[PDB]
Structures are given as C-alpha cells and as structure tokens.
Design a protein around this ligand. Structure first.
Ligand SMILES: *[C@@H]1O[C@H](CO)[C@@H](O[C@@H]2O[C@H](CO)[C@@H](O)[C@H](O)[C@H]2NC(C)=O)[C@H](O)[C@H]1NC(C)=O
Ligand code: BEF
Ligand SMILES: [Mg+2]
Length: 1055
C-alpha cells in the first residue's frame, strides 16, 4: 500500500523554488505554513523512479487512512553495472532496474532451508563476498550524527522563535532595547542548550551502538584469525572464540555446542545451551526454530567441539537487519509526543492571535480618529499584537521544570529533557521489569532439605544454621571455583552457595583447601581427593572429598534433579522425589540435587584418584535437594501498595518464564490474595482449524489476566478486536521479546493511557524511549536511551518522579494562567490609554515587564511537592471551564477596577485633561497614565498571589517565604510610589496627587480587588465542579481505556 513516486525538474526551476524558500531558509515558510503536507506533496519536481535522486514514499493504513509522508535519497553504487539501493525508514529496499521492482532485505528469507544453511559451511574468496557486500550492505550500525547548521535550521523552524524574532525587530524599531536584549539572550542560550543536548544525545548513541571486534572467517582457502571487523557478509561462515566471545553478527550454528548469556533478549545471568541445526528438507530457517541461532549482542561464555575439529556457524542477519538493529530502528524515528496541555497551550495562543488581530483593527481605527502619523499607526497596532501573545511565555514554563530538575538531582534522580517531568504528573499506568528492577538481579538459597530418612525430611530455612555431616561437606566440596586476588570466580549460584555455608576457600593433587567459619558450638576442615566436570549432556559434577578423620574417602556430587535421581539407586531415592521436584519447578523456584557414592580409593595417590567419569558417576545415594530463588527487594512491596492506594495501575513486562512471573507478582502485590488471575494462551494458526484463545482460570487462596510473548503475538495478529479487552485487564506479560515490549507500550498509548516504564537495561531500552516517562535503574546502556536515570536500583524513584511531576504540572498551569492574565491586563490598560492619545510610557512598560512579572514568575515556580500521594490527579485541560471561567471573571474585575479608577479620576474637581493633539509619548506626565499605571501595577502583583492554589499537589503558599517577601517589597515600592511625592516618579514620569482622599480611594479600589480576586478563585474552586455535577453527573470520558473499563463493568469478558 506504500505510495512510491520518482522525481526530476529544470535546474533553474529547482533554483527558483530555492530562491523562494532556501534564501528564506524556511523560517518565513512555516511563519506562512500551518502544516507542510500541501507544500511537501509537489514542492519536489516529479519523474520515473530511475530518474528520482529522492523518492516520496506515502505509507497509507487503508482502514484508518493513515497517509504518513516520507522523502528518501536514491543510492547509486557499481558492483563491477550500477544497482539502485533505497535506504527507506533505516532498512534497505533494493530496486532491480531489469524488472522495475522494489525488494526488501527478505531476499532469501523464504527458502533458508535447514540443510541449505548446513551446506554453506565454506564461503568464496571474492566472487560471492564483493557482490553480497554490495547487495546487502556492510555489517555495522551507521547512525548519521546531524551537523549544528542542520539542527539550528530545524530548531529555529519552531514558530514561537520566529514570533520572538519579529518581536525583537519591532522592540528594536520602537527603541525598547533593555527588555528585547533579555528576550534575545534567553532565546539564544535556550537554542544553544537545545543544540548541545541533541548533538550530545546522538554522539553517545552512535558511540554506544558500535562494535570493533577483530574476528576469524571459514573461507575454504581463508581461515585467518581476526581476518576482519565489519566486513562480515550475510552468507558467510565463521569460527567462534573458545571462551568469552561477544557475538558481532546473528548466525545459525552449523556444528558444535555453545553456552551463551542472552542478557540482551531474556534479561537473565544464567547460560542457554545451543545445538547444531538438525538436517531437514523443508523451509527450516533458524528464526522459527530459535534453538540453533546465536542472536547478535549476546556473549558466548563457553564453546565445545566433539563431532568435528572446531565449532562452526553461518551468518543469518547483519547490520540494521539483526534484532539489535530492530531495537536501534525502534529508538530512532520516534513517535511524536502527544499531550492535551501541550496542544491546548498552542490552541490558547492561537485564540490570543485572533483577539490580537481584532485588537489591531480597533487600534488602527482609533489611531486614525486620533489623527496620528501613518508610520505611528503600523508600529503601535503591531506592538499591541506583541502584548496579547506574551513573548516570554515559553521561558516562564521552563522555570517550573528547571526547579524540579534540581530537586530530583538532590534526591539522586538524574534528568535530561526537563519538560518531560510534567508528563510524570499525568501517569495513570506504570510498567515494571522483573529481573533487576523488582527482584534483586540474583538467585539466593531459600533452603535445603536434609533427606535424613529414605523419605524426604522437612526443609532447613537458614544454611548459616548448618548441621555438621555429609550435607555440610557436600556444600563445601561441590564447587567450580577459580583463583582471583583473595576473591572467588566461576558460576554465581555456586559462588553464592560457598558464602551461604560460611566456609573459607584457600596429597599431591589437592586444590582449593576448604575451612569452616572457625566458630564452635567438630569443624573438620576438608580436602578434595578428585574433581570431575559439569558437562552440558551430564548436567552434573562429581567431587571426591577426603576429610582429616583416618577414614576412606567418598565421592560427593551436585547435578539436575532428573539426572541425579536417575543415576541414584531407587531404594535410596524417595517415592515422592518427582512430586517434590514438580512442586518447586511448577512454583518457579530453581531445583538442584546433591548425591554421593562411597569410593574404594587410596588417599593422596594420583593413579587411584584418576578413574572413568561414568565409573565414578555410577550408583549413588540421594543426599538431599537445594532450592534458590530471587527475593523481591526491601522497598518493592511498600511502593507497589502505595501505587495501588493512589490507583496508578502496575504492569509486569518481563523476559522470564510465566510460572516465575506469577509468584513474584503475587509476593510483590501486583495481584492481591482476594484478586483472581486468569492464564490466557492462544495456539498458532492451522489450515484445518483456527488459532484457539484458550482462557484458563488459575486458582489461589478486579479480575486480571496473565500472558506469554507468543500468546500476546497471537492476540495482536489473529484477534485485533479482543486485544483492547486484554490490554485494559492484563497485569503480568511474561517471555516478552525486546521489540514486543515497545509494541505493548505503543499499543497501550494507542488506547489513550499515559504510560511509564522502569528498567534494569539492555532488554527494555526500546520501551524506555517509546514510553511517555522512562526511568532506567542502570547507569549503563539504558541511561543513554532513557529520559530519566536513578542511582538507588529501586522502584522507590517512581513515587518521587510522580510527586515532582504532579507539582510541576500544577505549577505550569498557574504560570500559564498568570502569563495569560498579565497579557490581557496590559492589553486592557494599553487599549484604554490608546483611545485618549496616551500609552503606558517606556520604563513604565519595563518595570511591569522585568521587575514585577519576571520576579513573581521565577518565585511562584519555587514551591516543592506535597509530602503524601493522593487518589485525585491534576487536570490535563488548559482549554477547560475551570481555567477559562477563572481567567474571564478575574479579567472582568480587573477591567472594572481600571475603568472605575479612570471615571473616578475624571469626576474629581482638581482633574485636568491632556493636550490630545501632540503625540502619546510627547505628553510624558498625565493623570490618566498615573491612575491607569498605579492601579494596573498592583493588579499584576495581586493576580500572581491568587492563581497559586498550592496545597493538594504542592507545598502550602505560606511556606514559600521569598515569594511573600518579594510581593511585600514590590507592594511597599508601589504604595510608596502613589503615597510619597516620588524620587522614582521622575524616572517613571508620574504626576503626584495632592488629594490624600483620592489616593486612599485608589488604594480602596486595589484592596477591594485583592479580596475579590482571592475570594473568586475559592468560590469557583468550591462551586464550579459541583455546579457541573448538577448540570451533567454521567459525563463519560472520550479516553478509550475508560470506555473499555465501563464496558467490562457492564458485560464481563469470559467468566
Ligand atoms: C500641547 O502641546 C503643544 C506643544 O507644546 C502646544 O502647542 C504649542 O503652543 C505654544 C503656545 O504656548 C506655541 O508656541 C506652539 O507653536 C504650539 N505648538 C504646536 C506644535 O502647535 C499645545 O497648546 C498643547 N495643548 C494644550 C491643550 O495646551
Ligand atoms: F530482566 Be526483566 F524481568 F525483563
Ligand atoms: Mg531485567
């Protein structure tokens, strides 16, 4: 369905439109452009696809008419005859000239036969390499880093900077130099900050998504160790490192076995066994099989070759085509951030432009009736447009976020993109990773069972509360420990077990001498007669152990429960061993087994110690079992309950097993004991029968759902109507692929849920960018992509960023309300003066613009977040009855007092009118200017104090002493100005008033409007929402998640 079109034109015609916009640089274009789509469509000069140096791709969703617009450069390269390559949306769409056909990177994706992959065990020197490299492109992730000119162009293409620049020109023209310099300086430094941040962001990501590992190849001639880095071709075969080898390219393993750490994919420290592709004739690609594939970014811990000379793999995916490349494409090209407040602030500024344009018509007529010069009419009419749309408005709202950023830093949460703190305020749902976020990134021994009798014994809770005997020794001598500088090294679970015991690790074959903690209530510090390894097939290690007791030594063994019991004799094995095994596995806890065979072998003799491995691992007694598991964290259980009390929904998005995810979720408090969990599983589609959504009730001592990654896939692909019902009710998503996690967050925010994500890192990076609020608990990798970063490795950050966000959103509303009110009060005063051939003089505008507004705007933004989180959430709607009625009624009182002041001044018998002939600036002192200025001066001070509500989301206003001190000092200067004959009246060009009565009446009008303003906010706060409930009590939200919740409450989904 993509709309792909070719392009060419006359060079003079392209230069002509370059004269129209490229000379302009676009900044006038958008100043004259609502949106570029109309311009974009045919700005470019069209042709056939071949002629096209740039190809317009307009991708349509047929169902929703989602006609997204793109324009993409044509790559021309010679293999030996030029082939046409198009780098669309990152990925390579390859055009064959002969068939006039666009083809994707899935060139051979179909017909990747299991046997065919097996056949390609050797790759040709040049004749395959060069052509394959040309067709598929190079094996590296090449993110282009944008130049400061290109960045400056697109940042400066924002319309508000263009309005600020126009504003700067009119200020410069009308001699308003001081304030203009402040506006210019604030603008310029914000642009510099923005460009630096955007470059730095790209620079670290480009650095981070790069790997320079010198590697071998399997060309039949060419097998040179470290032959190349990025030169790998998708078809090529490779030899692996024997130990500790990071995988550069996604490749199927042709022969040998491997043990690999899939940290990138599963978020697991444990290894995964990898086996050779099993020989088959069908279209048996490694992708679908998913056991015979080494995915890119993963570490090979151990490589082993037995059936051939060395381990062998064939490449499958390279560069942007690999899954890691999919994640890089996911973090790039990001979905635009859509918020109600942000659009509504722009819409309110649009309404101000209409009101300003209407204002200019009144200004132009009244100035012509006033009979001013032609030049004056253009300057003063445009000046009024700059008053109605306040040019410092963006800078004001930044001050709110700038304070919160600093507060968060002191608590230890580090924040790039300060504006995103506000998004925190509106979070309804927060997603959480399990391993490293909510569950401690490590396995700890829950306990061991003794097996004193033939039947199993009750479990021992604490290994530190040790009983001396064969179990004590079995823990001591069952170890795979290496040597570092007074430090243990090897399998972390085995390393943990040696610490659990309290033992210390320091004959001709004796290694790693084993000692007690040296506390006494017979400690018998033990030695190892022989040691036999943990082979992947074996699933077990047998360690023969000699005590200093003058007794013949016995073999003590550790392994998997199945294998250990299978090798153990059935008389020794318990009857319910399998049932206990089943209980711990199904419960999700790890099951490991300890067993022993007495050895007729002589002490200290190498010959006697040496045996056949299977001879040593022959017929054994079951010594007992060991159980280890993740322990949640200290702070996890508290926070999740507080999130539940707040009614901010909690979702577990993990890469682990479903059964494990359930038990952590139950312990965590994602699902309460009274609450009911339903397992939802759906099979793959068949020609014979459709894919069946099998819903299973899960019994246990707000009914919600549990998914697997495959099941989630089957719901999105084969049940699109039901997916909404699953997303609004699902609480635990298990075995989720790194891409699938981002698609969950994308589909959640499609339903009009605001979405946050908490992440350990490297599996969740895609989501951390994709989510509205992304908090990385790692200092590594995730930090680069994540909007926010924490140092505490805890869910504890989420409460703090919620609280700060709620406060900052409330502060941002108040600062907007004030700046809008400030705009309109100056518009009311300047209109009333303009009719009389007067205007608020220069340095009277400056005082208002700098010392009153910038002080109160930057001191009302200081208020800290409220101590307790509450069920009620801040409003999102800047275009709402509550805000608009507040602005309207406050402005009616503002207008009323100012007009009341004027007509009162006119009435008094000492009153004298002005010249009304010479210009508004030339009449420097006048009673009308003095009374308008004096009354207006206080109203800016008053409004700032009233609009700040404080308590439910922020600290109490009476706590914020500097704002009250600043208000008091500014109140003292303004009351001083009117009451005293002014030393400062000379600078501001005011007229001192003899009549104390009239001065006290003018204070009378001010003190009235203070009480009026402070009351009316309280009246609307306590009445207007209640009065709305009377008008409509059943106003259901357009938010789709709310509608689906209402629907589910009426008709419940499969009960
Ligand atoms: C407003 O100011 C103007 C300018 O000072 C006044 O007009 C001047 O009046 C004096 C007489 O004292 C003449 O010498 C000037 O020639 C006049 N100038 C102009 C430009 O006409 C005007 O009288 C003042 N308005 C009022 C009501 O007194
Ligand atoms: F490592 Be997490 F549980 F996806
Ligand atoms: Mg994890």
């Amino acid at each position: 369905s993509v709309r792909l079109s070719g392009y060419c034109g006359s060079p003079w015609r392209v230069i002509g439109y370059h004269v129209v916009v490229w000379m302009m640089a676009g900044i006038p274009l958008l100043l004259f452009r609502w949106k570029p789509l109309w311009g974009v469509r045919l700005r470019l000069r069209p042709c056939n696809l071949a002629h096209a140096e740039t190809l317009v791709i307009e991708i349509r969703d047929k169902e929703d008419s989602s006609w997204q617009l793109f324009t993409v450069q044509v790559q021309t390269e010679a293999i030996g005859r030029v082939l046409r390559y198009y780098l669309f949306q990152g990925q390579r769409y390859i055009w064959i000239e002969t068939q006039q056909a666009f083809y994707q990177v899935s060139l051979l994706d179909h017909g990747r036969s299991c046997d065919d992959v097996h056949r390609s065990r050797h790759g040709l020197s040049l004749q395959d390499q060069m052509v394959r490299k040309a067709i598929y492109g190079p094996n590296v992730i090449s993110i282009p880093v944008k130049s400061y000119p290109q960045l400056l162009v697109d940042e400066a293409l924002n319309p508000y900077y263009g309005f600020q620049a126009f504003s700067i020109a009119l200020w410069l023209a009308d001699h308003y130099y001081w304030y203009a310099l402040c506006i210019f300086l604030i603008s310029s430094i914000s642009i510099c900050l923005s460009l630096y941040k955007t470059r730095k962001q790209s620079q670290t990501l480009r650095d981070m998504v790069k790997l320079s590992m010198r590697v071998c190849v399997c060309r039949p001639g060419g097998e040179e160790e470290w032959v190349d880095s990025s030169e790998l071709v998708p078809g090529d075969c490779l030899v692996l490192p024997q130990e500790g080898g990071l995988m550069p390219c996604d490749a199927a393993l042709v022969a040998g076995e491997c043990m690999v750490n899939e940290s990138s994919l599963t978020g697991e420290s444990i290894p995964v066994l990898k086996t050779a592709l099993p020989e088959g004739l069908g279209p048996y690609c490694a992708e679908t099989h998913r056991r015979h594939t080494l995915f890119c970014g993963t570490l090979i811990l151990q490589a082993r070759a037995y059936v051939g000379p060395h381990v062998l793999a064939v490449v499958t995916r390279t560069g942007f085509c690999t899954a890691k490349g999919g994640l890089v494409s996911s973090i790039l090209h990001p979905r635009p951030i859509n918020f109600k407040f942000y659009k509504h602030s722009m819409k309110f500024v649009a309404a101000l432009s209409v009101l300003a344009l209407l204002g200019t018509i009144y200004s132009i007529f009244i100035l012509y009736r006033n009979r001013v010069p032609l030049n004056e009419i253009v300057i003063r009419a445009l000046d009024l447009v700059t008053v109605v749309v306040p040019p410092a408005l963006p800078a004001a709202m930044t001050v709110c976020t700038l304070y919160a950023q600093s507060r968060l830093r002191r608590q230890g949460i580090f924040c790039i993109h300060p504006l995103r703190i506000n998004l925190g305020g509106k979070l309804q749902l927060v997603c959480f990773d399990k391993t490293g976020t909510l569950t401690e990134d490590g396995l700890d021994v829950m306990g061991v069972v003794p097996l004193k009798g033939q039947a199993f014994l009750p479990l021992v809770p604490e290994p530190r509360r040790l009983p001396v005997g064969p179990l004590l020794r079995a823990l001591a001598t069952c170890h795979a420990l290496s040597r570092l500088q007074d430090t243990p090294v090897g399998d972390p679970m085995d390393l943990k077990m040696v610490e659990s015991t309290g033992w210390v690790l320091e004959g001709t074959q004796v290694l790693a001498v084993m000692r007690p903690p040296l506390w006494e209530p017979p400690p018998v510090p033990v030695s190892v007669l022989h040691r036999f390894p943990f082979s992947s097939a074996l699933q077990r290690m047998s360690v023969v152990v000699a005590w200093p007791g003058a007794t013949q030594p016995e073999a003590y063994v550790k392994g998997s429960p199945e294998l250990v019991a299978g090798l153990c004799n059935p008389e020794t094995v318990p009857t319910d061993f399998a049932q206990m095994l089943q209980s711990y596995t199904a419960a999700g806890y790890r099951v490991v087994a300890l067993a022993s065979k007495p050895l007729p072998t002589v002490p200290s003799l190498e010959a006697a110690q040496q045996l056949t491995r299977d001879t040593v691992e022959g017929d054994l007694s079951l010594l007992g079992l060991l159980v280890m598991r993740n322990l949640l964290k200290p702070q996890t259980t508290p926070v999740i309950q507080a999130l539940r009390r707040t009614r901010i929904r909690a979702v577990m998005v993990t890469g682990d097993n479903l059964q494990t995810a359930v038990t952590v979720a139950r312990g965590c408090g994602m699902v309460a004991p009274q609450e009911h969990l339903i397992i939802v599983h759906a099979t793959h589609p068949e020609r014979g029968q459709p894919a069946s959504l099998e819903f299973l009730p899960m019994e246990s001592p707000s009914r919600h759902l549990a998914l697997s990654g495959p099941t989630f896939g089957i719901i999105v692909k084969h049940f699109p109507k039901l997916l909404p019902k699953v997303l609004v009710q699902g609480t635990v998503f298990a075995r989720m692929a790194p891409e699938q996690k981002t698609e969950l967050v994308c589909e959640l925010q499609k339903l009009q849920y605001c979405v946050g994500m908490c992440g350990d890192g490297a599996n969740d990076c895609g989501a951390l960018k994709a989510a509205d609020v992304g908090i990385s608990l790692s200092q590594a990798e995730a930090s680069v992509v994540s909007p926010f970063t924490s140092s505490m490795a805890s869910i504890e950050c989420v409460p703090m960023v919620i609280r700060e966000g709620r406060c900052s959103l409330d502060t941002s509303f108040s600062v907007f309300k004030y700046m809008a009110l400030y705009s309109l009060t100056q518009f009311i005063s300047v209109l009333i003066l303009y009719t009389i051939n007067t205007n608020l003089g220069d340095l009277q505008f400056l005082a208002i613009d700098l010392v009153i507004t910038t002080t109160v705007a930057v001191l009302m933004s200081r208020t800290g977040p409220a101590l307790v989180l509450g069920r009620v959430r801040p409003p999102g709607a800047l275009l709402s009855v509550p805000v608009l009625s507040s602005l309207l009624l406050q402005m009616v009182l503002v207008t009323g007092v100012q007009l009341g002041g004027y007509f009162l001044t006119l009435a008094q018998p000492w009153f004298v009118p002005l010249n009304r002939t010479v210009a508004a600036p030339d009449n420097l002192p006048n009673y009308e200017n003095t009374v308008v200025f004096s009354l207006s001066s206080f109203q800016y001070l008053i409004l700032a104090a009233a609009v700040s509500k404080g308590a439910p989301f922020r600290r109490p206003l009476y706590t914020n002493v500097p704002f009250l001190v600043a208000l008091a000092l500014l109140s003292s200067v303004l009351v001083g100005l009117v009451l005293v004959p002014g030393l400062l009246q000379g600078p501001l060009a005011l007229r001192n008033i003899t009549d104390t009565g009239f001065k006290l009446l003018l204070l009378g009008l001010v003190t009235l409007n203070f009480v009026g303003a402070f009351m009316l906010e309280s009246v609307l706060d306590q009445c207007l929402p209640a009065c709305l409930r009377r008008l409509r009590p059943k106003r259901a939200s357009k938010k789709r998640f709310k509608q689906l919740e209402r629907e589910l409450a009426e008709q419940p989904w499969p009960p």
